[PDB]
């Protein structure tokens, strides 16, 4: 067969790589959906208390920001 | 017995991903080279093809015309053939 | 001169089967020993490069689309 | 050349597929944090106010759940 | 030439079909955001006022659901 | 067979490409329907509070605009 | 066979084209019926509030016009 | 010539049928907006006043439903 | 002159089987060596181009319609 | 055993999409060229056919008549044949 | 075993559509040409038939009578034969 | 003259089997070499054209009706 | 009718000389160019063409 | 048309001389370069090329 | 038989016998220079195209 | 000189099949005894090293991806 | 019978881990050597290859050009071949 | 093109002399080094190399 | 037969007989120096490329 690096190039190789790409693309779409949801949640938090929440969007702090908003009230 | 809708749309997602990957081909590099002369793309491609170098030198000089001989023309034609075949691997 | 002719033929098969691009008769003089060099307009060479590049990218993307369609088909 | 369903396969095909896999893997690694934060926010809503859509994870409903949840307090 | 059901097929046919696929793929990628936003709005209506058509996604009913929902408050 | 690029031109190739185009066209119609629904929702929001909502239509902000309208009242 | 463009002319070709025309003609009749219904709805809206609704018939605004009529009262 | 049930078929027959298909396709594309608007109006009636014929789509009844619906308010 | 005649025949088969367009007898003089060139009215050539173009586009769209109908048929 | 209504309307959707794609043919390019002389379409097509160039030069000049010889006429006729066959690929 | 009523009325709908399509034939074009002399229809048809041209020239002149020779008469008769056979494609 | 006679016969078969239209004996003189041309009344030629046109359109519409009826029949 | 002469030339072409390599086709072409004229050809050329058609027909007859 | 001459050269090439090692191809090349000229070749060279085509065809005939 | 077989067996140095017999069906001005016993032949683009087409056709089949 | 030639061929097969890198003709002089040494620009050698390194790392990572995909496939 | 989604994502996790392991190859060491001259990576690699030493000495000197002979060039080429084959084990 | 000469040397190498032990390879190397020059070789050496290729081909023919 | 078999059996010291017979189909300037009985041959890059290609092709197959 033709070869790329250490991998034989044939129908089965392409099929396997395509299966991996299929599942991984679905996963990427789901995760992008999650990012969009977090952005929407952030905007909700912003409109609730815009006097402090208009600093910058940060996924890893938004849960803590929501918990803080609860802590204040 | 046509594939289901979900199968076709999964193929579509694969296609979008693979085309995003394809955005890095040498042909693409030439296409999105906004410089009036293809100086940046040919600088990148000069590490992969002799014809790229032969085109590159005069185009940097901003020459209105470029003189090519038999050997340079052969190299340039092979460069374009490689661009078509997608045998240049832009790193 | 034979090498130039055959390489033109190769790029012809890849890019322009009927040889309608203006570049072809402008490169033809190099097949004659007396015409050691040819002065070509930079814009013409750039346009020829862009023709090759755009056709190539379209072919690549279309091959990717064909592969995706066949994957959806399953029996590939 | 080998073929996939009638489309020619060469070494560049496999190379491109493998580059796609690696790039997507990096993207997925980056994106996992978004799932973790989204699920944390979902659980905040579920625990503090058990009701209705708190009984099923739904990224498209959670921003409105935040709206309701945080506006109530 | 090959035929499809009795209509001639040439290389330009396949080329046109593949260009169609790629253009449509770009269009679909652009349009997905509209589905995401529409479903977010649907869930806003469902969560804040559970009733009737809130129990089934229906893009042609949701604008009237917004009319009702937002006019009530 | 005749060939386009790397793809053989024959009945089966056209049939597969047509199946893909069929599903993708249906998807495009559904997504265009969603865009139309969002436009109608935007017009509803506009007639409810035209003093501020007559700026410009933007799918990615309309959910947040609805949530804001709720926030005001 | 005789040919038109790339299509063979025979009994089966005509039969298939006629099937397509049949379904499409039925669809056109249904859609024309819908247009007539919208015209009748517009006339109803006009007789309810003729002081403003006698401008011009426009299918794409009639839903919004009805929603507006509700908004006023 | 070929025949359809005993009527002669020539290339002009197929040409005319194909022109008919294309013209009808353009007409149908134009007309789809009418269905979308009619269904939106139907859903307005259904949502704001659930009763009787609101439980079944009927383009010939909807104008009278508008008469009733809008006259009541 | 043979090449011109045969190319006229080819475009004839594609565009006008009975050769009723006015362009044909206006191009015929080029088959005689003495008539090295023919003065044609720009409007006539444009109209001939438009005839070819509109007929071609109609044929393309009709072939697409035939393919769609056969796809609906299934057995294709 | 006629195809269902949904099958036929799916074919119709396919047809509308494919015709929207077909809007980019050379024949179309000529048709929608609003210039009194087909200057823009022939400029685009001059990169694909010699006859397009031969027609192009005089039509830019706004000549009331165009002189063609045997070779130019052959090229123009081949150009129109290609327009019919849809072998020109407008990029 | 007669076809159902719905089948017959579906055929009727098809017939109405196809006849609306048929309204564009050359015979129709001649029929709906309201000009006292068939000048407009013959101008359209002169791009498709020689006999149309031969009739056209004098009818524009508003001649009370038209002189035809053997060749012109043959062309006119062939024009009418084409109108009957519906071989003229009005674009 | 043979070509004119046979073309008259063709249009006869298509339009008027018994040759009762007034145009036929008015065109007959062209079969004699001496009668190089014939003066015809414009109105007569227009009426002949309209006869051909109306008969043709009726035939086309009736063929469409026959096709529709056979489609309803199914076994076609 | 120049169109008729051209179409008849093509009709005979399809059976006698597909590529149109016989000189008689150039010799006859002028009739398609100008009106009210004629082409004077040698009886040798015309009878040779007629025997050429005869030989083509004989080959068809054998087949 | 220089393009036509080139394409015909390639067509004959595919059947007579794939690698184009015959001198006649360089001898004919000038026609692709400048307009309004001709190439004067020896009758020995041209008839030798014709017999070369004859020999290639004979080998095909045997096969 | 075959056109190029006739070309081979023709004993004439110029082979003008076969060139004549085949020019009656193929466009070759060759006949005149070769019958004239010229040392060289002036070939332009157009005639060269006919030479190439002729040689290809006789390579495949031009039996009369 | 034979050893240098063959080692160039080996690294060629690994890194650049068409030998388009500028380093190759700059190293060629060492095949001639007279050219005992060649002065090379440090930047060129560094760039050649980086080309080799980046290509190598990409190949390694892609082989790892292929192994992962085959593991997912199971039948390996 | 495609692998499940969980199987593919498990393979993806394996891939990420193995690539993190692969970050320690000699090719990587060269790639992430931020020094203007690859001095640090070549110091590390000089314990594994002679060509690394031959390159190393002058590059530390910050020479604009490096003179190589047949033997040194062979060693450098073998060094790069090893970098490609990933036969150097960086400890 | 020095690159072309090198690649052709490798191509012939793969079939005539895998290890490149013939002196002709060193004799030809200078052409890869400097531009605008040539290498003067003995007709004895070149014809001996040609017979060497002949013998290698003969061994292949026997096999 | 084979081109290199002809090369072997050629009795001429220079083998210019076979060199001539094969140069009619292969690009070898070799013919002239060898027919001239030269002691050495001046070979440039381009001609050397043709020599290498010729030798490879005759190694495989160039039977005429």
């Amino acid at each position: 067969w033709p070869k790329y690096g250490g991998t034989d190039v044939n129908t089965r190789t392409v099929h396997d790589l395509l299966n991996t790409i299929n599942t991984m693309s679905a996963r990427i779409k789901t995760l992008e959906r999650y990012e969009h949801a977090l952005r929407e949640i952030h905007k909700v938090v912003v409109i609730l208390k815009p006097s402090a929440n208009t600093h910058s969007f940060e996924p890893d702090a938004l849960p803590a920001l929501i918990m803080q908003f609860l802590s204040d009230f | 017995a046509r594939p289901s809708a979900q199968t076709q749309m999964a193929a579509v997602d694969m296609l979008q991903t693979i085309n995003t990957a394809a955005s890095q081909t040498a042909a693409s590099l030439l296409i999105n080279d906004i410089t009036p002369n293809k100086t940046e793309s040919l600088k990148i491609l000069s590490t992969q093809s002799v014809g790229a170098r032969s085109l590159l030198e005069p185009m940097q000089a901003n020459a209105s015309t470029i003189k090519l001989n038999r050997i340079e023309t052969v190299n340039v034609l092979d460069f374009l053939g490689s661009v078509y075949d997608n045998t240049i691997q832009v790193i | 001169a034979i090498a130039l002719y055959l390489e033109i033929n190769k790029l012809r098969l890849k890019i322009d089967e009927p040889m309608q691009l203006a570049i072809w008769p402008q490169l033809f003089p190099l097949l004659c020993d007396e015409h050691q060099s040819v002065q070509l307009n930079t814009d013409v060479l750039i346009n020829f490069m862009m023709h090759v590049a755009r056709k190539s990218q379209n072919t690549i993307l279309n091959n990717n689309a064909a592969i995706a369609s066949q994957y959806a088909a399953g029996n590939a």
Side-chain angles (χ1 to χ4, degrees), chain A, chain B, chain C:
Chain A
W1 295 107
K3 292 176 73 174
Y4 170 71
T7 299
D8 291 345
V9 178
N10 61 46
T11 278
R12 182 170 294 107
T13 297
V14 170
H15 185 71
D16 291 343
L17 293 175
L18 291 174
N19 286 335
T20 297
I21 294 181
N22 182 7
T23 298
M24 252 161 55
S25 293
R27 180 66 179 169
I28 291 169
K29 289 201 40 167
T30 298
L31 293 172
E32 259 319 331
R33 184 177 182 184
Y34 291 163
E35 174 177 340
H36 177 74
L38 279 207
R39 214 81 61 81
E40 292 316 90
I41 291 167
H42 180 72
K43 287 187 286 187
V44 170
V45 152
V46 170
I47 70 200
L48 271 283
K49 183 179 180 182
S51 68
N53 292 329
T54 57
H55 180 71
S56 178
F57 164 89
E58 171 46 0
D60 293 337
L62 178 61
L65 195 32
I66 270 176
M67 291 177 176
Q68 183 65 260
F69 189 61
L70 248 172
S71 180
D72 291 349
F73 182 83
Chain B
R2 294 178 295 177
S4 295
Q6 291 177 337
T7 299
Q8 289 291 343
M9 301 305 327
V12 171
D13 289 339
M14 281 175 48
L15 179 58
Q16 291 175 1
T17 278
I18 293 168
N19 286 344
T20 278
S23 151
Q24 301 344 114
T25 60
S28 178
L29 178 62
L30 289 171
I31 291 167
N32 289 337
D33 184 352
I34 64 171
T35 299
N37 270 348
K38 301 292 172 170
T39 70
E40 289 296 316
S41 57
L42 289 175
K43 298 221 320 209
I44 293 168
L45 295 175
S46 72
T47 65
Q48 303 304 30
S49 179
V50 152
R53 264 201 291 291
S54 294
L55 293 171
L56 181 163
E57 178 180 0
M59 301 215 188
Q60 289 175 319
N62 166 339
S64 66
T65 63
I66 301 174
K67 323 211 150 209
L68 329 168
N69 67 31
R70 176 180 176 271
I71 270 178
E72 309 201 1
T73 279
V74 169
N75 287 335
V76 171
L77 291 173
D78 163 33
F79 166 70
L80 291 175
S82 198
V83 170
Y84 181 79
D85 288 342
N86 198 28
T87 51
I88 298 304
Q89 283 184 10
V90 185
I91 299 170
Chain C
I2 297 300
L4 177 60
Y5 179 101
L6 281 183
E7 156 54 11
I8 291 168
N9 185 53
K10 164 163 311 193
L11 186 58
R12 179 188 69 82
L13 270 173
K14 284 173 211 333
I15 300 299
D16 194 338
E17 177 71 34
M19 296 180 79
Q20 303 284 350
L21 301 153
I23 195 64
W24 301 124
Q26 292 178 343
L27 271 43
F28 282 173
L30 291 172
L31 294 175
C32 178
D33 142 81
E34 291 177 351
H35 294 299
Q36 287 290 304
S37 67
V38 316
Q39 153 148 346
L40 308 204
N41 194 327
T42 299
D43 288 346
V44 172
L45 201 43
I46 292 169
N47 287 341
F48 180 39
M49 290 169 67
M50 294 302 98
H51 186 273
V52 171
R54 290 176 180 173
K55 182 176 175 65
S56 36
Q57 188 63 26
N58 174 357
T59 301
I60 298 284
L61 293 173
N62 286 7
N63 284 336
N64 289 344
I67 272 154
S69 281
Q70 303 264 350
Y71 184 90
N75 187 356

